[PDB]
């Protein structure tokens, strides 16, 4: 309930991704309450807060991975697959343990939803 | 399995020269429970044509399956070496005299001796060296024929096809009209047969069918190349398996150039006619009867099974073409199978092939399926719109992350 009024009070508009979306998704994932985060996941983010610095790619990967896991938990595969795809295709020059165990889950969700592993962009 | 209907004596007598032995070799390869007797008959009938290495190979094979005049064969080898040395001396003399015809004849004789001995690399090198000596178009055609036949013995079909095409297109497309309806020397028929054999061995059945029907009967029989009976068999099977109804009617049924070939083999003629006349029980029965004999061929056996499947498949789509709902008991009786096997084959065809139908297995009836165009277009358009919206949202997010310079290092 705190990192829910701390998100819409600090971001510009509803379509602006801030570094607290990842924390909200992680908190509502650790305690199995997937309903509070739905209003913050159904929105298609189209701008990203610079946050006066900081905001590495870790927050981006965390948001687009935990949201996919939340959507998988509610059996919304059509959007969990999209979230995992957004997590994988982040520009990268090294290996992180959020782009690996998101490709691995993307394969499984693609097999469950479709009949085949969808080709990455 | 085993078939005595094939007359090995007549089949060997159809061909002449070295090639016969090669064919008999396949008879040794495909002869369960009769390989030894067939090989003994082949040795008894075709002991001629100066077999040396293959003779010893076959003798050892039959000895190990179920001493000789080694002095005479060693003396024959020594005499062959002396003849080869004399031929080399004559070739050197011709080179000193600088006569193109003399050196060409010497190279041809050396290649012939290599053929009857078994040498292929030296013969190939000799042919490659002699290829660089061309003066007139007749000599070009002659050396093309020589290299084509030795490559057929060498079994490199891509080169044969390429050089046949080049030699066909070189002389202003076969002299335009064709020198007053072809020449007495039917070289064009030989080129067509060689191209057909190459394309058949290169897994292109339709091209072999198309170019093997243009061979004429005036060529009689070329022992080095295919005999007329084999030409008819190949051009019938490939045409049946590849040509549709209009093509089969125009190029095989009604053409007055292939019927003379079909007179040699009446079974293939009956099979083609019964396929055309929608009589499939008899056609398939004759095909299955002749499959066992065809399996003993040399250039067609590896392609038999596939071809057969193709042919059978055609009949299926040709059976259901006029019908909007067909009883499967009559279909199974027509194709000489049970209803369950027919159902499995029909499902395999419906899943991917040309049959657009649905099986009602409560009453065993195959119903023709008519697609609805309006609903299909609506579904596809809505799916395309959904995919486009997803892609656009993803690209907007990608633009945002690229603009903000977000990456992992």
Swiss-Prot record, chain A:
User: Could you say which residues form the signal peptide?
Assistant: none
Tell me where in or outside the cell this protein is found.
Cytoplasm; Nucleus
Expression sites by tissue: Widely expressed. Expressed at high level in heart and skeletal muscle.
Question: Which Cys pairs does UniProt list as disulfide-bonded?
Answer: none
- What family classification does the UniProt entry report for this protein? Belongs to the CSN3 family.
More about this protein:
Amplified and overexpressed in some osteosarcomas (OS), suggesting that it may participate in TP53 degradation in OS.
Task of the protein: Component of the COP9 signalosome complex (CSN), a complex involved in various cellular and developmental processes. The CSN complex is an essential regulator of the ubiquitin (Ubl) conjugation pathway by mediating the deneddylation of the cullin subunits of SCF-type E3 ligase complexes, leading to decrease the Ubl ligase activity of SCF-type complexes such as SCF, CSA or DDB2. The complex is also involved in phosphorylation of p53/TP53, c-jun/JUN, IkappaBalpha/NFKBIA, ITPK1 and IRF8/ICSBP, possibly via its association with CK2 and PKD kinases.
Subunit structure and binding partners: Component of the CSN complex, composed of COPS1/GPS1, COPS2, COPS3, COPS4, COPS5, COPS6, COPS7 (COPS7A or COPS7B), COPS8 and COPS9 isoform 1. In the complex, it probably interacts directly with COPS1, COPS4, COPS8 and COPS9 isoform 1. Interacts with CK2 and PKD. Interacts with the translation initiation factor EIF3S6 and IKBKG. Interacts with ERCC6.
* Protein name in the entry: COP9 signalosome complex subunit 3
Species whose genome carries this gene = Homo sapiens (Human)
Q: Which residues of the full protein are shown?
A: 122 to 242 of 423
Swiss-Prot record, chain B:
GO BP annotation list? JNK cascade; protein deneddylation; protein neddylation; regulation of protein neddylation
Localization, per the record, is:
Cytoplasm; Nucleus
Q: Which domain of life is it from?
A: Eukaryota
Q: Which UniProt keywords apply?
A: Cytoplasm, Nucleus, Phosphoprotein, Signalosome
Role summary? Essential component of the COP9 signalosome complex (CSN), a complex involved in various cellular and developmental processes. The CSN complex is an essential regulator of the ubiquitin (Ubl) conjugation pathway by mediating the deneddylation of the cullin subunits of SCF-type E3 ligase complexes, leading to decrease the Ubl ligase activity of SCF-type complexes such as SCF, CSA or DDB2. The complex is also involved in phosphorylation of p53/TP53, c-jun/JUN, IkappaBalpha/NFKBIA, ITPK1 and IRF8/ICSBP, possibly via its association with CK2 and PKD kinases.
Name the family: Belongs to the CSN1 family.
Quote the protein name from its UniProt record: COP9 signalosome complex subunit 1
Organism for this UniProt entry: Homo sapiens
